[PDB]
Amino acid sequence: GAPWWKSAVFYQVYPRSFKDTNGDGIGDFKGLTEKLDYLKGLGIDAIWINPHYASPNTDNGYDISDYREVMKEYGTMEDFDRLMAELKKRGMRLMVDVVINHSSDQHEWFKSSRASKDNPYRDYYFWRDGKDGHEPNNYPSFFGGSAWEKDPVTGQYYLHYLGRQQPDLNWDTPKLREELYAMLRFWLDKGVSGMRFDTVATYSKTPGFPDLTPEQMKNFAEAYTQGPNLHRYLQEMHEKVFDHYDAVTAGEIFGAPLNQVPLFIDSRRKELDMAFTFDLIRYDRALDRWHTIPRTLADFRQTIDKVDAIAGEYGWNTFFLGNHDNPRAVSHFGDDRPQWREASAKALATVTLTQRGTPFIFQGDELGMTNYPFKTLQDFDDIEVKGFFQDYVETGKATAEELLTNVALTSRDNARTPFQWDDSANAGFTTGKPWLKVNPNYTEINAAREIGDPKSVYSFYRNLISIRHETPALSTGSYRDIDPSNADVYAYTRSQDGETYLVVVNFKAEPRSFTLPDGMHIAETLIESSSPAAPAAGAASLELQPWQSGIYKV
Ligand SMILES: [Ca+2]
């Protein structure tokens, strides 16, 4: 038998933006608990929640000031316990986010570490002398300026790959590793079923902190994944923690070269169970992370083919088209214009739910939610956009208007607007003022209207999820791309135990034809979207409407 997580469908909840129950404009645990029936009815097996720990929220939960306490905005430990109990009543599982590349600068470890050079917490973090009058080296931060921040108390700099208020934890220090392992056991003893490791590839730092070369500077995210002790630390964590439990582990392998991914997920290596990779989701992103570079379906499918190959026999991939760090799937990979939004969102649901891997549906994608119409830079909450303002606008590299036009397409805030529950005030998300503005298209895109309509995006996701659950080949079967060079129609097979299925997805807003491989014929149509008629049993070809998708037994 294959482990449960290989055939599960996960849903990602960004709790801040899912459901508010107390008018403060921020989503909370009670809100999520009240919506479990909605997720159960969609067919979700497991939920991954973004970080839910005590946090000053300079990066919305990813700056944690106490790993053993819940975030004040989300509720109390009792609320979290109640969430767990209600998930369990429904046979559902919880995956939590684990953020141990860095902590908050408000964490008591860091308050102590920074206080002097000779204290027991000094080497919980990285403290270094500046060089030639400036920073220890030329490392940049993802969130703006240098990755090194001076502390006048000791006159040394501390390292922060992310924000200034997210100092990196020092995995080279054994006592620090032991603290992290104990903290993980604290949550696993509560029964959590999965853990997702934020920026898991950056834990090991390079000895001596030499300068990056000019080449490396342009792709610094990759350099940060090349620490010599990385796999040693991941293997130790598995031996001391995950060997004692029955939880699934998944790594956000951001910035690593694709050919190193098997090191994290080959089951023989006893590291992680599954990979989140970013080759596909960043396939059309410029190196600066805020421009977009036009790509075609041939690029999209060739990337998938490569990622599939690296899982091979002993590894396992997740599959996702959206998360809390990226623009909305239908806007990014589909066509979000009024006339094409529903058809292309369905086509993308078909893709997501028929890939070899564990699919993750990002909250609101089952409604066909879109990017937000930002008008000014003040419409963004996101600290990454403030950092681009700092690195590009303040330095005269770009104008504010150039930053705005381009980041409107790429910003994480596109994924973070409140979930659209119905057409009441604030889309039923809150009775107060939402922390981030609700998209005005909530009058046309909302759960209440979608659930009631058999022809909706929600209904199609629901139907695909049943089909996947009922068809073993569609989770664990082999994957074969019929024609990796085709830039119009995406077609592939899934097969297991002598049964083969064909998936065919038109990525053009125009009619297209499709010819099956010589010798292959349609046996049955499981489901189609935007199609006037199923093919005839025995068909050797298909006539596709704009954005038509389908699954066929062959
Ligand atoms: Ca609230």
UniProtKB/TrEMBL annotation:
Query: SUPFAM superfamilies from the xrefs?
Result: (Trans)glycosidases, Glycosyl hydrolase domain
Query: Any idea which positions bind Ca(2+)?
Result: 20, 22, 24, 26, 28
On whether Transcription is a keyword of this UniProt record, the answer is: no
Domain Glycosyl hydrolase family 13 catalytic, which positions?
12-416
One GO biological process term:
oligosaccharide catabolic process
GO MF term (any one):
isomerase activity
Sorted alphabetically, the keyword list is: Calcium, Glycosidase, Hydrolase, Isomerase, Metal-binding, Signal
Question: What InterPro entries does this protein's entry cite?
Answer: GH, GH13_cat_dom, Glyco_hydro_b, Malt_amylase-like_C, O16G_dom_2
Keyword presence, Metal-binding = yes
Q: Protein name, please?
A: Sucrose isomerase
The record lists the organism as: Burkholderia ubonensis subsp. mesacidophila
Supply the gene name. mutB
